[PDB]
Write a protein that binds this ligand. Sequence first.
Ligand SMILES: Cc1cc2nc3c(=O)[nH]c(=O)nc-3n(C[C@H](O)[C@H](O)[C@H](O)COP(=O)(O)OP(=O)(O)OC[C@H]3O[C@@H](n4cnc5c(N)ncnc54)[C@H](O)[C@@H]3O)c2cc1C
Length: 493
Amino acid sequence: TTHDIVIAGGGISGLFCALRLAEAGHRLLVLEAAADRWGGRIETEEMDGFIAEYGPMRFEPTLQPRFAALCAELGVGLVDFFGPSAADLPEAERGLNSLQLLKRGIMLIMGRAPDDQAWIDALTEADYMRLRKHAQLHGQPLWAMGFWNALSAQGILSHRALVKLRDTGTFYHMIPENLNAAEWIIWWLRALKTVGQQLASIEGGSARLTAQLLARLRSHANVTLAGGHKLVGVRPVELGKPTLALDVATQNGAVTLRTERLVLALPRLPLLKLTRHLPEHVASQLDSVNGFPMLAVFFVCSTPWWSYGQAPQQYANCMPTREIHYFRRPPEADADGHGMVLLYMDRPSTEFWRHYVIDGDQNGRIVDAFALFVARDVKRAAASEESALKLTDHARRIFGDLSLAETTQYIRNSIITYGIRDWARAPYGAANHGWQPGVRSWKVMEAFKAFDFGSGARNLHIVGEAYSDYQGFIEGALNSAELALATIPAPAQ
Ligand SMILES: Cc1cc2nc3c(=O)[nH]c(=O)nc-3n(C[C@H](O)[C@H](O)[C@H](O)COP(=O)(O)OP(=O)(O)OC[C@H]3O[C@@H](n4cnc5c(N)ncnc54)[C@H](O)[C@@H]3O)c2cc1C
């Protein structure tokens, strides 16, 4: 079968392109490799009555207008999230938490006063574009440097400030790979705006965005949705002509398709798997970004050791979990006193394994390692008297007495259900992506938004977060999508 447009990938960028293109009148097929679900890195589970988000959970709608507008268009309500969160240095640098020390370094790199919040607040995408293209540090373009290198530069931080960023986990958790300085500076500048505070979540779980989008698409007769179909090959039907032949694996076999246009709504790893089928000038740029790891771990406990309102805790260097969130039922509507713990572990999973997992299912060994981790935290709280972890007095005396081994066993045994998502694993290969130093991102984005095998047809496109100007977010996926959608002509009469 021939299709006028084929979109490979049913994550948010792919489905959004399907929507815009359907609305413009094109006839199109969306291929999604997973047999069981749509939405890609947007994944929500109901776990013992709790909403577990393996991907996005909270949003900042003022920083993410395309997302906000899409939600509004699809009748996806956003609900304000009010829940809780969070000496030896030189004079200038004493005072500041890690974020503020980072900000200072950035502000100084950009030749600004650290307190210059009005400039941060004023910066637009066009400013950001001039920053990546033109900003330099000691004569070197920032797009050419690692962000560690940038932060380490003459006149930016004291030698000790650098050490302190190391100890707070800045380089272990937040900036794990020393990626593109220009791109990191832009991203932090945006995130440091005043307006960047009002937090929301999606009513009914993040996957309600996907479900609404799917419902809309199902109402457009010029859209076909095919789950369980993975693009595994593409080439021109004939060299020098635009029409593409596609090879598609299904559950039970394969299908060969023809199309005039192919949207690859895919991140780095799935494109790497297609590398030999892609035009050379695109293939050779697939490593312009790297993938960031994330393991999202959820477990529901029959006998939680924390109360309603417990705030999330962030961890520092050498603690493989970036962050632990705690959840309880609303204390009026609390049938069972069950709680849920969400742990984000942002180090390479083979490093986590080699340090924390007893070899003698992998899932069960990982939960065990996490029970021990949590046990140490509970013991240190019980012994501490002032702790960010507000234990009860039931908990406080039990855990005070119990050994570490007994605390581990107790936590382990209280787990009635768990889920683990390792985003680094095939087929995703990453939670999100970042530009390499030495890459001019605007050139890659320009090449990827429309390209071909040399005929000039410009009828292949890459869209998604991975190679966007706003990595880490749905907003990035949507910006990348719009870049390519602006290159696609309205359908033939
Ligand atoms: C832990 C985590 C936290 C996040 N936090 C936030 C946050 O706070 N805010 C926010 O805005 N964003 C957040 N994001 C990102 C957001 O989830 C976006 O969906 C993501 O950034 C990408 O959407 P996308 O279309 O690029 O691709 P994906 O979501 O990667 O979709 C790609 C799709 O392609 C399919 N596929 C792969 N190979 C093939 C093939 N060959 N053929 C067919 N289909 C194929 C996959 O099955 C997948 O469904 C987070 C992500 C994660 C994982």
